[PDB]
């Protein structure tokens, strides 16, 4: 029932944090961007031009296009029973380079290096799967210098 302007209901979404107002720092201009790189759209409300829709303010998408001042981003949206790919054009002030695949890239470049080096020496490594947290280990807790302490239920008293 609410009105359907382009920034509807963005009182908190398109605000600035406490003691973090102001125009963006020039250090954002030294960020590289490449096609295929994932980015997080998070709107800088001090920058009024090139602002994406409020729908994409939490979303993360892959860059398909790179412009003079802006970036094209592929972001899927649910339209009923389907994901529809939207092309989001955003200024670079409204995006951050995403750390979504940050630990995957760190894992991949090391593991691909280790597979290359093992193939160089004629060996091979079978599987470098991430092992999840299994069962608990067996423990040994000695009572040497660690005496067991009784926990008791205590009588209910109230302070007033």
């Amino acid at each position: 029932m609410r009105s359907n302007g382009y920034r509807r209901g963005t009182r908190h979404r398109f605000s600035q944090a406490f003691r973090k107002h102001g125009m963006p720092k020039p250090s954002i201009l030294t960020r590289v961007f490449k096609k295929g790189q994932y980015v997080d759209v998070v709107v800088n409300p001090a920058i009024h031009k090139g602002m994406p829709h409020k729908f994409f303010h939490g979303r993360t998408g892959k860059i398909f296009n790179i412009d003079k001042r802006s970036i094209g981003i592929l972001m899927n949206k649910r339209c009923g029973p389907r994901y529809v790919e939207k092309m989001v054009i955003a200024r670079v002030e409204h995006v951050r380079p995403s750390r979504c695949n940050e630990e995957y890239i760190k894992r991949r470049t090391e593991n691909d290096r280790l597979r290359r080096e093992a193939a160089a020496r004629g060996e091979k490594l079978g599987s470098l799967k991430r092992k999840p947290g299994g069962p608990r280990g067996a423990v040994l807790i000695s009572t040497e210098n660690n005496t067991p302490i009784e926990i008791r239920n205590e009588p209910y008293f109230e302070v007033y």
Partner: protein
């Protein structure tokens, strides 16, 4: 099986020969029984019971003792009874009611 179990009992009584407390490594699997019926299940809980292959009540499976599987068992813990089978419960479940998916 007897040698593995005897080694843990010998590890446990030697620890209480000293002051220590020894609990072994907890088993590599849970045994899970579907308790509640198939009705009125929310879509997350209905999905987890599908991935545990528990599609009717009084059905039992083994799930791995993983950290992701423990979180799956926790979210449907109002629908299942789960715990730790020893080797006697493992072998009784498979030899008495054990079929193959071929």
């Amino acid at each position: 099986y007897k040698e593995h179990m005897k080694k843990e009992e010998d590890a446990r009584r030697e620890a209480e020969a000293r002051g220590a407390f020894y609990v072994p490594k907890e088993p590599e699997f849970y045994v899970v029984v579907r308790i509640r019926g198939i009705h009125k299940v929310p879509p997350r809980e209905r999905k987890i019971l599908e991935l545990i292959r528990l599609k009717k009540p009084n059905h039992a499976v083994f799930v791995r003792n993983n950290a992701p599987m423990r979180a799956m068992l926790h979210k449907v813990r109002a629908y299942i009874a789960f715990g730790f089978a020893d080797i006697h419960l493992l072998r009784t479940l498979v030899y008495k009611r054990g079929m193959a998916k071929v």
